Structure formats: C-alpha cells, structure tokens
Amino acid sequence: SFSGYLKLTDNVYIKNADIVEEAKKVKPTVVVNAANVYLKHGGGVAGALNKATNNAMQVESDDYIATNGPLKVGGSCVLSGHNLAKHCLHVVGPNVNKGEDIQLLKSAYENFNQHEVLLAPLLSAGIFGADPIHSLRVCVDTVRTNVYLAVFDKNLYDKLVSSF
C-alpha cells in the first residue's frame, strides 16, 4: 500500500514525507517511533506521532514505564499504533546531544528485523544529533526486512538521495 517511494536497495525505500500523514494514509502494520528510554514523546517524530493520537500514545507509554521501567539505548518495545498503525515499535537510538554512544545505532536498527514490513524515520537523525547520511548507511547495512523511510525535510531528502 506504500506509494511514491524511491528504491535504494532490495529492501530499503525512501520518500520525502511527513511520517504522521504517511501513517494515516497507509495505516501500516508497524510505524516506528524515534523514542527516548522514558517514552516521553516531547518533540520531533515522537511528539508528532503522540499529538496525532490525541495523547493516547503518551498515556499508554506512561503505564508501560510504570510497570517495566525504562528501555535501554538501542532497545525497543511494541505498543499500540492507535489511529496510525496496528502497532508502534518504539526504538531508542543514541542521542548525540546527550553524549550517548553512536555505536549503539546499529543495535537500534536490529530491532526492525523482528518485523516483516515497517514505516519508519531515520534513527538518531534530527534533534538526536547524528549525521543522517551515516544513519541511512547503518540502516541499509543492518535492516533485512522491508523498510519504508519517511524523511520530512525536503532539502535533507535530496541530499540523502544524491549522496547514496
């Protein structure tokens, strides 16, 4: 059901799109959230997905944290997709602006291999402070399942495609 994606490899596809608008259109089985260890969906992709669920994602996430404690950096948990998807795979990539180890990004992408097809952002890019070109390279070299990447920024999308 995905459309207008550019094929990068056998299993990796990319599109200049708002992941919230893409999610409401496709209603995929899994939408990936660029989460932090506490599942506090304040800004970036996480704040945009949470706002699209009318804060239902935050309420569900606080109950998950109250029961299980925080995630590890490089880890993940599967929660409801609410009105956007069947499931939301909350993945924690290293936040360079918090001094976290960029080496954990490959461990972060390995979480995608547990799902046949996913709609996702570039992990650790944006407000997480990592080089998006490096994030796309780690993605293509780590994920074996079908991943459809949504890149919000037009200028960044062009840079990623032209330098791939």
Ligand X SMILES: O=C(O)[C@@H](Nc1ncnc2[nH]ccc12)c1ccc2c(c1)OCCO2
Cβ–Cβ < 8 Å for 73, 94: yes
121 lines the binding site for ligand X (CB under 6 A): yes
* 145 to 164: interface string for ligand X, x by CB under 6 A: ------xxx--x--------
Binding-site member from 109, 112, 128, 148 for ligand X (CB under 6 A): 128
Residues 6+ apart with CB under 8 A from 98: none
Binding-site member from 34, 39, 73, 105 for ligand X (CB under 6 A): 34
Pick between residue 51 and residue 63 the one whose CB is nearest to ligand X.
51
- The end-to-end CA distance of the chain, in Å, is 25
17 lines the binding site for ligand X (CB under 6 A): no
Three-state SS at 90? strand
Closest residue to ligand X in the complex (CB): 126
Say which DSSP state 145 is in.
S
Instruction: Please tell me the count of residues contacting ligand X according to CB under 6 A.
Output: 14
Report residue 92: phi and psi, to 5°: -100, 105
CA distance 110 to 143: 6
132 lines the binding site for ligand X (CB under 6 A): yes
The token duo for 101 is 């180890």
133 lines the binding site for ligand X (CB under 6 A): no
Shortest gap between Cβ of 67 and ligand X (angstroms)?
Answer: 25
Question: Residues interacting with ligand X, by CB under 6 A?
Answer: 34, 44-45, 121-122, 125-128, 132, 151-153, 156
